[PDB]
Amino acid sequence: GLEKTVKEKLSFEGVGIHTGEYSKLIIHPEKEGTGIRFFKNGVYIPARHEFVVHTNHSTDLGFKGQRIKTVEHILSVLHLLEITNVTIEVIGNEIPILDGSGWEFYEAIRKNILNQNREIDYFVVEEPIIVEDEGRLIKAEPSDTLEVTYEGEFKNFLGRQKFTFVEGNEEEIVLARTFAFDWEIEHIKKVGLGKGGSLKNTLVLGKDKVYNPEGLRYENEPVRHKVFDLIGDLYLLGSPVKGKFYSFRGGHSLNVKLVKELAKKQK
Ligand SMILES: O=C(NO)C1(COc2ccc(C#Cc3ccc(CN4CCOCC4)cc3)cc2)CCOCC1
Ligand SMILES: [Cl-]
Ligand SMILES: [Zn+2]
Ligand SMILES: [Zn+2]
């Protein structure tokens, strides 16, 4: 496909899930070859794995003393739409969580795409690889299309569930919301996270209960969301990705470990 930017500046705002602070984004058009980067307080932070500073409960980037939490949702949307050149100006410390999904970003960006004059140079997975950490595993292998499967093994009523994204099915994962288990909320608060989490932006589940009165958007909403997160973390390779991925219980730490191993192997 062609490299793409946005036709005009696009703004989003609201509370961040971890900081609980209100922040604002401005997405700016950029020329061919710029890449995806964030901008905060005069500093450009490329959306690349070298700038990862934290991976527990979100993927966060930093450079030169400026940090931005929770980049994975906006990056997943840009990856799915194949937007390749843009500056995400952040006024605040975190990307707004909005409803917990990528929907509002997706709908707004998709209607504002500007095709550019060069083709995309994809990051093409060249050979099979497996990364592992304490029972969690991710496998990547060659594919002409981006294909991503996540399999979860939940310790509640959901049990085992799997979901596969393929190209053309972006609408199947951009509405799946971030989620949390009630027995884990004390830990996330104790480590200074989840300050913006509420039933308005998170699907909260108990051992047997669904807290949200509106219920699940899909019976497998959590694994759809985990696929969505992994697609965002894969964009830290610095180019849209062609490969087939399978994650068993992966999280941001393992997603970034895979990205760094793929990047080292091919560059
Ligand atoms: O989406 C992701 N990363 O991209 C992941 C974000 O982690 C998180 C996402 C959300 C949270 C949270 C929260 C939270 C939500 C609601 C209340 C309010 N209470 C609910 C119980 O009743 C009383 C009122 C209180 C707290 C915590 C962590 C990390 C990877 O796993 C998927 C989720
Ligand atoms: Cl932690
Ligand atoms: Zn933790
Ligand atoms: Zn997420």
Side-chain angles (χ1 to χ4, degrees), residues 72-73 178 225 229:
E72 57 269 25
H73 298 176
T178 194
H225 187 80
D229 282 343

Side-chain angles (χ1 to χ4, degrees), residues 103 106 110 165 168-170 172-176 218 224:
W103 181 241
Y106 190 83
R110 185 181 62 172
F165 163 82
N169 292 359
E170 296 75 17
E172 296 186 347
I173 64 176
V174 298
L175 290 131
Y218 313 96
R224 291 184 189 224

